[PDB]
Design an enzyme around this catalytic site. Structure first.
Site, short mmCIF file in Angstrom:
data_model
loop_
_atom_site.label_atom_id
_atom_site.label_comp_id
_atom_site.label_asym_id
_atom_site.label_seq_id
_atom_site.Cartn_x
_atom_site.Cartn_y
_atom_site.Cartn_z
N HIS A 41 0.82 -1.22 0.00
CA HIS A 41 0.00 0.00 0.00
C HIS A 41 0.85 1.26 0.00
O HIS A 41 0.30 2.37 -0.10
CB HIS A 41 -1.06 0.04 1.14
CG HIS A 41 -0.52 0.01 2.54
ND1 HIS A 41 0.16 1.06 3.11
CD2 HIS A 41 -0.68 -0.92 3.52
CE1 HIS A 41 0.47 0.75 4.36
NE2 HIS A 41 -0.04 -0.43 4.64
N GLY A 146 2.10 5.53 10.53
CA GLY A 146 3.54 5.55 10.29
C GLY A 146 4.22 4.23 10.59
O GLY A 146 5.39 4.02 10.22
N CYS A 148 3.42 1.07 9.62
CA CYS A 148 3.36 -0.07 8.73
C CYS A 148 4.77 -0.43 8.23
O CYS A 148 5.63 0.45 8.06
CB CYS A 148 2.41 0.20 7.55
SG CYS A 148 0.65 0.17 8.09
#
Lengths: 304, 304
Positions: A41, A146, A148
């Protein structure tokens, strides 16, 4: 003595953390050999997070679309010379091999299993904690925007077994991520849409381990001669929000050491689950299920 | 979202851990600059651990009496060129400065304060966890034979504040150690004799932080208009095994964010301490007191 939430020392994994930036998104990646892993993503436009078309996003990318920065130790930019998608992860190839790559494997953890998480923001480690993969294939972590690409791992001696890369928050304090084959734990989709989870359950085998831990630390008021068989307990468990119990050699080692049968502790659980009625077990007034048999054996008896 | 037992990443401190051997004893030390710190009981003969005469042991030592080995990274023996005693610690001077010395300070933590511990055996880090200095000046850790010299620390940005060096087990799951001025937390003696501890108490300010954490995570059934003043609560606290409450700006930030007054949560505690009568708060059925206001602000609101 004492039993606490214990994580692995994180230094070996800290040396593998990097920042990955694509478009209007930045997050953490894992640098092993010439490969950098990160959630796919990172490709999504920061305002298109509901139903992305990842196949379409991928073909629109080139190597130039990604930047990889190492902050730990001394800064370095790591030139991207290849990109590929594997399930819900990207595999970026970079032109330099991480000189600090540990001995490692990839594994997929099962419900009840514990692992350490190194929480990272902008390529910088900020905290570490231990979680248990829940019976509904989520983890109860602590993650903000923040985070991930933060990673989870177990260890076998000096070998690091990477098992989790953080992807999303499903509900308050409820999280999931990918194994390194790119599959999401619980099969949750990496998009921002409503996604129902199964109900959480008590991890019975970890409850049993913790009760053995309590006995080994001078706390055994709950032990009686009464017994419940594994097969009878398991039928009950399914009716009452407990996992089915599966014995292991690690549990057997605790039964031998204490002289208390698994079946005595299964009976106890059946009396204790509605409440301890004023009493406490190792400072808790409810059943604790995030200490595994291996964790108890390691912390209390020093066996690995 | 989510609130968990979180430790600092331990890599910076891992690079400072060494093994110290004297006589028939081996344990862990901390290597900063040209100094190696370790517990002074490394000097005691392994069968003389009840009432040692440390002054007499010290004068019987020379630099040759100590060996310091680094295992992390690549092995190195660190030549000892000086030895001194500071309270319950030794300060060994070695002929090489640790090239990985972090920016650091020494501090002494107070009851209610949290810090990270890096548990080590034979100079090798094995686990990390977070503890709170208890109101009776012990910590509830997880330590076995071989763990002395394990260190505890907080951080201020990149600065490491070393605050604890592990020394002893007082009772099941109950531990203490030294600050780096060589004073033992709780003034316990470094010998093997019976030593009574004060009773443990709930850390009221951490309970209040955790209740705010519960509100911020969608859990607020315990909030009512009823209020108990700090002065009235504190009189009650002393009668009922709670610490006296001391407000801070960190707590104030939580009160502002939630719109719930400290005094509403003090009242709640007074209703909740005998049990939640079937209810739960963030998955617990008793008051949790090892999450500080700073921990809650950091984990949930991302503020440091």
């Amino acid at each position: 003595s004492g039993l606490v939430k214990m994580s692995h020392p994180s230094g070996d994994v800290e040396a593998c953390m990097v920042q990955v930036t694509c478009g209007s998104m930045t997050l953490n990646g894992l640098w092993l050999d010439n490969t950098v892993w990160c959630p796919r993503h990172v490709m999504c436009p920061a305002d298109q997070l509901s139903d992305p078309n990842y196949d379409a996003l991928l073909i629109s990318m080139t190597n130039h679309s990604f930047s990889v920065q190492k902050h730990i130790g001394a800064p370095a930019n790591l030139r991207v010379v290849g990109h590929a998608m594997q399930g819900t992860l990207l595999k970026l190839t970079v032109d330099v091999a991480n000189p600090s790559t540990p001995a490692y494997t990839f594994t997929t953890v099962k419900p009840g299993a514990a692992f350490s998480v190194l929480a990272c923001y902008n390529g910088r480690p900020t905290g570490t904690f231990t979680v248990v993969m829940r019976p509904n294939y989520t983890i109860k972590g602590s993650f903000l925007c923040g985070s991930c690409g933060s990673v989870g791992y177990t260890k076998e001696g000096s070998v690091i077994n990477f098992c989790y890369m953080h992807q999303m928050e499903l509900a308050n304090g409820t999280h999931t991520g990918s194994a390194f084959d790119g599959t999401m734990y619980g099969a949750f989709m990496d998009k921002q849409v409503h996604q129902v989870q199964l109900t959480d359950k008590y991890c019975s085998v970890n409850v049993v381990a913790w009760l053995y831990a309590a006995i080994l630390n001078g706390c055994a008021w709950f032990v009686k001669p009464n017994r419940t068989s594994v097969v009878s307990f398991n039928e009950w468990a399914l009716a009452n929000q407990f996992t089915e119990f599966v014995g292991t050699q690690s549990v057997d080692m605790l039964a031998v050491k204490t002289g208390v049968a698994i079946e005595q502790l299964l009976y106890a659980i059946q009396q204790l689950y509605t409440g301890f009625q004023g009493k406490q077990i190792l400072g808790s007034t409810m059943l604790e299920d995030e200490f595994t048999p291996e964790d108890v054996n390691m912390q209390i008896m020093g066996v690995v």
